[PDB]
C-alpha cells in the first residue's frame, strides 16, 4: 500500500492510507471556566480530554442551572484537526467515562486547588457537527 501511495503521489493523483484507530488528536488536557470565583464556590465551564483516538468532554455547572435563563445552560466545544479526513465511522456514547468522579485539580492560578463533585445526568439536545 505504501509504495502504491508513493507512486501515485509522484504522479499527482488521489492518495490514501488506511488506518485503524488513527492517532491524530493532539494531547491537550485543558479546562475552561466562565463563571468563576476566587474561592471556587460556584463554577460554570467546560473540561475536556482529547487524547489518542478518543475525545471525552464534560460540561459542568455548580448552580445546576438554577439562576439561568429558563433552566437551560449551553456548552460549546470546537476541536480542529491539522489534516483532513475522509470516510470516517464514529463510535459515540452519551456518558463521560473520566469526568464523573470526585476529583481535585489545581486551578489556572498556578498556586491553588479546587474540588470537583460530579453528579451525572443525561445530556439533552446532543448535537454534533462535522464541518469542512
Amino acid at each position: 500500500e505504501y509504495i502504491e501511495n508513493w507512486n501515485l503521489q509522484n504522479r499527482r493523483q488521489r492518495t490514501g492510507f488506511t488506518f485503524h484507530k488513527p492517532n491524530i488528536f493532539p494531547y491537550s488536557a485543558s479546562f475552561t471556566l466562565n463563571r468563576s470565583q476566587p474561592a471556587h464556590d460556584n463554577l460554570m465551564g467546560t473540561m475536556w480530554l482529547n487524547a489518542g483516538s478518543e475525545i471525552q468532554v464534560a460540561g459542568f455547572d455548580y448552580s445546576c442551572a438554577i439562576n439561568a435563563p429558563a433552566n437551560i445552560q449551553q456548552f460549546e466545544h470546537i476541536v480542529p484537526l491539522r489534516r483532513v479526513l475522509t470516510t470516517a465511522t464514529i463510535t459515540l456514547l452519551p456518558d463521560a467515562e473520566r469526568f464523573s468522579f470526585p476529583r481535585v485539580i489545581n486551578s489556572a492560578d498556578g498556586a491553588t486547588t479546587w474540588f470537583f463533585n460530579p453528579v451525572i445526568l443525561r445530556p439533552n439536545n446532543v448535537e454534533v457537527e462535522f464541518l469542512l
Binding site: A29, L33, Q37, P38, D41, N42, N106, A108, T113
Partner: protein, 268 residues
C-alpha cells in the same frame, strides 16, 4: 487589565503547579471581666508572632453586649473571627447576626411613608436595625386593600417584631405590604442576598449548635466557616484558637470582593 467582563480562563493538568495577613477578633466584655487581666493582649500578640504572623497589625475590639454588637456591626479587616456566646433563650439573635455577617447584602433605603413594597426573588429580605424597632405590616391584595387589617388605621397591624435591636424579616411574594414604623430611631432597608461572604467566620462559644443561614425552612445546612467548641474558661478558648490558627486561615480566605482585580462587581 480588562475589568468587569467575565471571560474564559484557559488551564491545564500536565503542568506542575502543586505571611502578610491582618487578623481581627470580636469578643464580649464578660470574657475580659472574667480573665481579671489586661496584659493578655501582649501575650496573644507574642503567641501570634510565634506561629508566624507579624504583630502591630492585629487589632482587638470589644462590645458591651450581643445586642450592642448586633446594631450596626463594623467589619473592616482581612480575616474576621468573632466569638459569640451561646444561650438557650436568644437563638434568633445569634442566627440573624451570623446570617448578616456571613452573606453580602446589596441594600437600598426604604421609605414606608410614601410607597408600598413587594418581593420579586427568594433573596429578598428586609433588615431593620436601630435602638427600638417594631415593624408593623398589613398585607394588601392585588386590589390594594387590607385583608385582616384596615389600611386607614395602623394599630391593627400584625406585628413581626417588638423593640428588637435587629430583626430580619421576609414577606410573602407577589403581594403589596403597607408598613408603619417609628422611623425616628430605626431604619429599614431592602437587601438582596447576592452571594456568600468568606471574610467573616463565627465561632459559637457555647453548647448546642442551632445556627441556620437560609431563609427557606427546607434546608438548614451546617457550613464549615461556622465553628463551635465547648468552654469554661476563656483562656482555654484563646489557646485552642491560636493553636489551630493554621486551620482557621486555610478554611477562610481573602475577601472575594477586594482582590484588587474584581472591580465594578459591587465592591472596589
Amino acid at each position: 487589565q480588562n475589568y468587569g467582563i467575565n471571560l474564559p480562563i484557559t488551564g491545564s493538568m500536565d503542568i506542575a503547579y502543586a505571611l502578610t495577613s491582618t487578623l481581627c477578633l470580636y469578643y464580649p466584655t464578660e470574657a475580659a471581666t472574667e480573665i481579671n487581666d489586661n496584659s493578655w493582649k501582649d501575650t496573644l500578640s507574642q503567641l501570634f508572632l510565634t506561629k508566624g504572623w507579624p504583630t502591630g497589625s492585629v487589632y482587638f475590639k470589644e462590645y458591651t453586649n450581643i445586642a450592642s454588637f448586633s446594631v450596626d456591626p463594623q467589619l473592616y479587616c482581612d480575616y474576621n473571627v468573632v466569638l459569640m456566646k451561646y444561650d438557650a433563650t436568644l437563638q434568633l439573635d445569634m442566627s440573624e447576626l451570623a446570617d448578616l455577617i456571613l452573606n453580602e447584602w446589596l441594600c437600598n433605603p426604604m421609605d414606608i411613608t410614601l410607597y408600598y413594597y413587594q418581593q420579586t426573588d427568594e433573596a429578598n429580605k428586609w433588615i431593620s436595625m436601630g435602638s427600638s424597632c417594631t415593624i408593623k405590616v398589613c398585607p394588601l391584595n392585588t386590589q390594594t386593600l387590607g385583608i385582616g387589617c384596615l389600611t386607614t388605621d395602623a394599630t391593627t397591624f400584625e406585628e413581626v417584631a417588638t423593640a428588637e435591636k435587629l430583626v430580619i424579616t421576609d414577606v410573602v411574594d407577589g403581594v403589596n405590604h403597607k408598613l408603619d414604623v417609628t422611623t425616628a430611631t430605626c431604619t429599614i432597608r431592602n437587601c438582596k442576598k447576592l452571594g456568600p461572604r468568606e471574610n467573616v467566620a463565627v465561632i459559637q462559644v457555647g453548647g448546642s449548635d442551632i445556627l441556620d443561614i437560609t431563609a427557606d425552612p427546607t434546608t438548614a445546612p451546617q457550613t464549615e466557616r461556622m465553628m463551635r467548641i465547648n468552654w469554661k474558661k476563656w483562656w482555654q478558648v484563646f489557646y485552642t484558637v491560636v493553636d489551630y490558627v493554621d486551620q482557621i486561615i486555610q478554611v477562610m480566605s481573602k475577601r472575594s470582593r477586594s482582590l484588587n482585580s474584581a472591580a465594578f462587581y459591587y465592591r472596589v
